């Protein structure tokens, strides 16, 4: 729901963001602190969705 | 026997060492940026920002 946004923790995985990048199914695809095409080079832990 | 007889020389050495130490420590300030390390911000964003 709008005021009860679902929260998910993602960790201990390998995921390709290029399949997310090239996909046109997303009307808005906008990042803030990371370049979308650099997401497969450096990496982090404890992803929140 | 008596120590602290050579004051001025020690003061000179301490002043120089302190200047170098604060100069080195200044390398760890964001100065208003997003990070204090340069390789990361190279490998985290696009040229425009």
From Swiss-Prot, chain A:
Effect of residue 25 to P: In strain: Omicron/BA.1, Omicron/BA.2, Omicron/BA.2.12.1, Omicron/BA.2.75, Omicron/BA.4, Omicron/BA.5, Omicron/BQ.1.1, Omicron/XBB.1.5, Omicron/EG.5.1
Effect upon mutating residue 23 to L: In strain: Omicron/BA.1
Effect on the protein upon substituting residue 20 to I: In strain: Omicron/XBB.1.5, Omicron/EG.5.1
Complexes and interactors: Binds to host ACE2. RBD also interacts with the N-linked glycan on 'Asn-90' of ACE2. Cleavage of S generates a polybasic C-terminal sequence on S1 that binds to host Neuropilin-1 (NRP1) and Neuropilin-2 (NRP2) receptors. Interacts with host integrin alpha-5/beta-1 (ITGA5:ITGB1) and with ACE2 in complex with integrin alpha-5/beta-1 (ITGA5:ITGB1). May interact via cytoplasmic c-terminus with M protein. May interact (via N-terminus) with host bilirubin and biliverdin, thereby preventing antibody binding to the SARS-CoV-2 spike NTD via an allosteric mechanism.
Free-text function comment from the UniProt entry: Attaches the virion to the cell membrane by interacting with host receptor, initiating the infection. The major receptor is host ACE2. When S2/S2' has been cleaved, binding to the receptor triggers direct fusion at the cell membrane. When S2/S2' has not been cleaved, binding to the receptor results in internalization of the virus by endocytosis using host TFRC and GRM2 and leading to fusion of the virion membrane with the host endosomal membrane. Alternatively, may use NRP1/NRP2 and integrin as entry receptors.
Protein's recorded name: Spike protein S1
Organismal lineage: Viruses, Riboviria, Orthornavirae, Pisuviricota, Pisoniviricetes
Residues represented out of the complete protein: 349 to 397 of 1273
């Amino acid at each position: 729901s709008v005021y009860a946004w679902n929260r998910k923790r993602i960790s201990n995985c390998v995921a390709d963001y290029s399949v997310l990048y090239n996909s046109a199914s997303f009307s808005t695809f906008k990042c803030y602190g990371v370049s979308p095409t650099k997401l497969n080079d450096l990496c982090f832990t404890n992803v929140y969705a | 026997s008596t120590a602290s007889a050579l004051g001025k020389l020690q003061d000179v050495v301490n002043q120089n060492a302190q200047a170098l130490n604060t100069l080195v420590k200044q390398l760890s300030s964001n100065f208003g940026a997003i990070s204090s390390v340069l390789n990361d911000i190279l490998s985290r964003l696009d040229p425009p920002e």
